[PDB]
RNA sequence: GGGACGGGUGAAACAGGAUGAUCCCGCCGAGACCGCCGGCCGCGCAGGCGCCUGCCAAGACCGCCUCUGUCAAUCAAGGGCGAAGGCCGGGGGCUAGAAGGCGAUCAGACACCACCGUAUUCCCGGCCGUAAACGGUGCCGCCCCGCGGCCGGCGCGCGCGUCCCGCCGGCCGCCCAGGGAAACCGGGAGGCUCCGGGCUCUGGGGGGAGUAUGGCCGCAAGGCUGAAACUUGAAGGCAUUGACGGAGGGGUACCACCAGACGUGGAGUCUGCGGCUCAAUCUGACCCAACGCGCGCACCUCACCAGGCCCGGACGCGCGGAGGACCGACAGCCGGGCGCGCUUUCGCGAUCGCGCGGGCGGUGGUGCAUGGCCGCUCCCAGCCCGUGGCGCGAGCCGUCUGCUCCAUUGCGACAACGAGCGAGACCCCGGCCGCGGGCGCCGCGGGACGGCCCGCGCGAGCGGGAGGACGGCGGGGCGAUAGCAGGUCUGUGAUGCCCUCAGACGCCCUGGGCCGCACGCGCGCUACACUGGCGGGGCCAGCCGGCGCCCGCGAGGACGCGCGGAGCCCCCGCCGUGGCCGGGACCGCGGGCUGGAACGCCCCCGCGCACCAGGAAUGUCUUGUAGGCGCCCGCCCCCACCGCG
């Protein structure tokens, strides 16, 4: 399914922003575990967790290949010079 | 010259062609016209103005230390010009073309389309004197934010280019203020309720009516001037939201189509529906959004028809009542039958009776008085809030003239910012795996997410390929705001207002009807046969589920115990294109079941209607789908061609 409601996008974002180092760009199992983790957030369902994780993956690689709008990745370091 | 069609239309048909058409070339004649350049260019009082050459007069503007000295502005009466069409008298006669004719189209078409064609269109002389003759805005005059284009003339500066800086006049575009009902104007429609520069003309709700009667002009057609009676409560202007469009641009769906399949409409029958009938054949619903639907009519159900018992009249006031209120019965008749009623004669005892008030009940009416529940708009994707801003205001922005999505699903912008519902998310079912448990396979979890590769695309996301039980909304449920005079008072101790209320529409019994049939159609069933019918045999389902022995051909029956699954299909044979062994409607004896009671339902023998694939018309459908085959439940004393599965 190609439906991506707002909730998925906003949640996947806040999650990537608040938690990068613990993750990888193309994985789906590590990202799924990170989402399932309690500190990061809470997902009542399973299908929701899977969808959010997938969107997290696609955002993460879209970022790692190149900086992405709306993402507070903490990248001033390389440009604050 | 050459040899067969040409013309014309959406498609055709009238007219032309072996008398040589259409087609190519050349020549001849006449009369109209003045193209591409041609324009937010220009000229003219307006109407209007475009070939070469030449002639005649005229005009605004610019430049000027040239002349005069108020000679000016606007205007009834009066005068002149005045598109096209039209008229009088003469010319000329190619195009087009009122009238007229003819061919199509149409229900008709004397109209739109095709073809032929008169006046007219052209010139001279003269009448007419009207146009959305529009900038729908009178003439003269002053002030007025800013930017820009073009035309003509003049001047300034320089690095001399047809440069850039200005002046006058003219034609235009945008626009700050300001104005206005607003659209809009802004080279005023500004400087005006803070309401006075000068001159002229017109109007006073809509029709009657620019009509009648007079007058003037005109050959005429007609023009200028121009009432009343009567009638009427609105007619109009600018703008807003919806609905509609034989309007445009994007999208979408087997209740749309393409490609195909299976059908219906043809016959007989089941069932419901209108009509006809009867004593009654009780009713509701009429495009999708009524017509096997309001869950199986011998009695009840049941409302309708013909007839009969009962009060089951609560509760308060007056009266009477045990010196007897009210209620039952043997026998005999009449009555379908009953002590219903009739002829006597016995019984019981205040549980009351009569009049007045007031109840209860009713498948009685109004669904256009209502609640609730359904259907439809809607097999959609849309709907609203707070702050702020634009408008006098109804209203608008937010809520998208971009790209994607099945989807107001998302990316990216924007006088908008920030939220919510709906959508998705969610719940049930199934497919693969793990753990546990177990009379009987049933409890908890995992797993799939546009995740991986490749292309593109800023992106959202699109196309392909993999591995995987399953690959991109697998099937159902729930279902936004707003609304319909949709259906239901015949579902109810849900109901407002009317009408029934002791010879009752109350309640109970006996029969009958709802099924009656010259007729039109809606959902279905069975068949038209060899891809078949008949006989014997073998054999596998799931929602789920009860069997033995003995009689009887069978249907069924008498006993006694707890135990259990089919059609198609496959195999061997008969038939052999004949309305034949296809098809089994209709009808005639008989044996049984249900039930108080067959009109209902099964079995046996016999008889053996149409029907040879069904016209105009029309329905449904994309994987375990269509179609074919059968099996269980609902209602039900018996009964499924129905419906949910
Ligand atoms: C009801 C009269 C109309 C129908 N007819 C005959 C059938 C026909 C068939 C056509 O091709 C499909 C056709 O082309 C469009 C025209 C016709 C005529 C046309 C009649 C109507 C006519 N006037 C109104 C609209 C119209 C539009 C047309 O389209 C341009 C047209 O074609 C020339 C003719 C017409
Ligand atoms: Mg003329
Ligand atoms: Mg005028
Ligand atoms: Mg005034
Ligand atoms: Mg007035
Ligand atoms: Mg008037």
TrEMBL record:
Keywords: Ribonucleoprotein, Ribosomal protein. One of its GO terms (biological process) is translation. The keyword Ribosomal protein applies. It comes from the Eukaryota. GO terms for molecular function: structural constituent of ribosome. GO terms for cellular component: cytosolic small ribosomal subunit. The keyword DNA repair does not apply. Belongs to the eukaryotic ribosomal protein eS17 family. This is Ribosomal protein S17.
